[PDB]
Amino acid sequence: QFSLRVEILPSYIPVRVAEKILFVGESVQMFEKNQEDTFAAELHRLKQQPLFSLVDFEQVVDRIRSTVAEHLWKLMVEESDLLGQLKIIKDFYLLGRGELFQAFIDTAQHMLKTPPTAVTEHDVNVAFQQSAHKVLLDDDNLLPLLHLTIEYHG
Amino acid sequence: LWHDKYTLRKSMIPSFMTMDQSRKVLLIGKSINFLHQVCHDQTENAFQGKIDAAYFETSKYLLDVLNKKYSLLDHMQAMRRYLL
């Protein structure tokens, strides 16, 4: 998790490209062919220029930016399916699968009108687990990933 | 980037360039300087032929990038249908 600096940033460099730099790099450090050497020739080329031309500094950054972004979108959607994951969030977070909750509310009702204690946190995770099976939803995937929390004592 | 930042210096024009030829260089320089920054794109008698050769190519290219990448004409027609 890196950040950006402004109190040391140059003057003639705009913050817009500064943000572009901060993203194109972190998208590599986190991520742990021909798209590698050719840009090295581009950067080296600028080192030969006897005059710093911002109008050209962006035409090399933005292409590098758009290439990694195009490469990242390929993974964030196709390989790592986002649609399936968003479909999970809409169902459970946003009450998309409301039919699961009317049963969970039907069961785990008396154990919540009382003030919360140190034991109620587990008294509901089971009831929620009794619920998913009560709606014939049988999937060991994405079932243990959902853990209800009880903000107790603060 | 057209109306200002470019001035024809009446004092430092060489005698061997007619006053009209000095307005075809200030227009070819401006046409390329403006093609890079704002448009966001990167690429005697024989002397008179060089100015015109650099004119009938740069300007003809400035319209192509200004009609395909921005459709300057398609806005004039659309600005008559609605605004007029």
Q: Report DSSP letters for A56-72, one per residue.
A: HHHHHHHHHHHHHHHHH
The region that residue B6 occupies, defined by phi over 0 for left and psi between -120 and 50 for alpha, beta otherwise, is: beta
Q: What's at A105, amino acid-wise?
A: I
Segment (H or E) for B35: helix B22-37
Amino acid at A10: P
Burial class, A1, CB count within 10 angstroms (exposed 0-12 / middle 13-18 / buried 19+): exposed
* Residue A147 φ/ψ, nearest 5 degrees: -130, 110
Alpha helices in A74-141 (DSSP H): 82-92, 98-107, 110-113, 120-134
What is the DSSP code string of A117-131? -SSHHHHHHHHHHHH
Burial class (CB in 10 A: 0-12, 13-18, 19+), A127: buried
Question: Are residues B55 and B28 in contact, defined by beta-carbon separation less than 8 angstroms?
Answer: yes
Interface of B with A (CB under 8 A): 36-37, 40, 42
CA distance A125 to A114: 17
Angstrom distance (rounded) from CA A129 to CA A114:
21
Residue A120: is it exposed, middle or buried by C-beta count within 10 angstroms (0-12/13-18/19+)? middle
CA distance A57 to A5: 19
CB-based burial label for A131 (10 Å; 0-12, 13-18, 19+): buried
- Is the minimum CB–CB distance between A59 and chain B shorter than 8 Å? yes
Helical packing angle, B22-37 and B46-68, nearest 10°: 30
Q: Across the interface, do A56 and B42 touch by the CB < 8 Å criterion?
A: yes
CA-to-CA distance for A77 and A84, rounded, in angstroms?
A: 9
Residue A30 is classified by DSSP as T
Contacts across the A-B interface (CB distance below 8 Å): 6
State the Cα–Cα distance between residues B22 and B13, nearest whole angstrom: 8
The tally of CA atoms less than 13 A away on the side-chain side of residue A13 is 16
Q: CA B57 to CA B32: how far, in whole Å?
A: 11
A85 reaches B (C-beta below 8 A)? no
- The CA distances from residue A75 to A32, A66, A78, A82, B18, in Å, are 14, 14, 5, 9, 62
Distance of CA A146 to the CA centre of its chain: 17
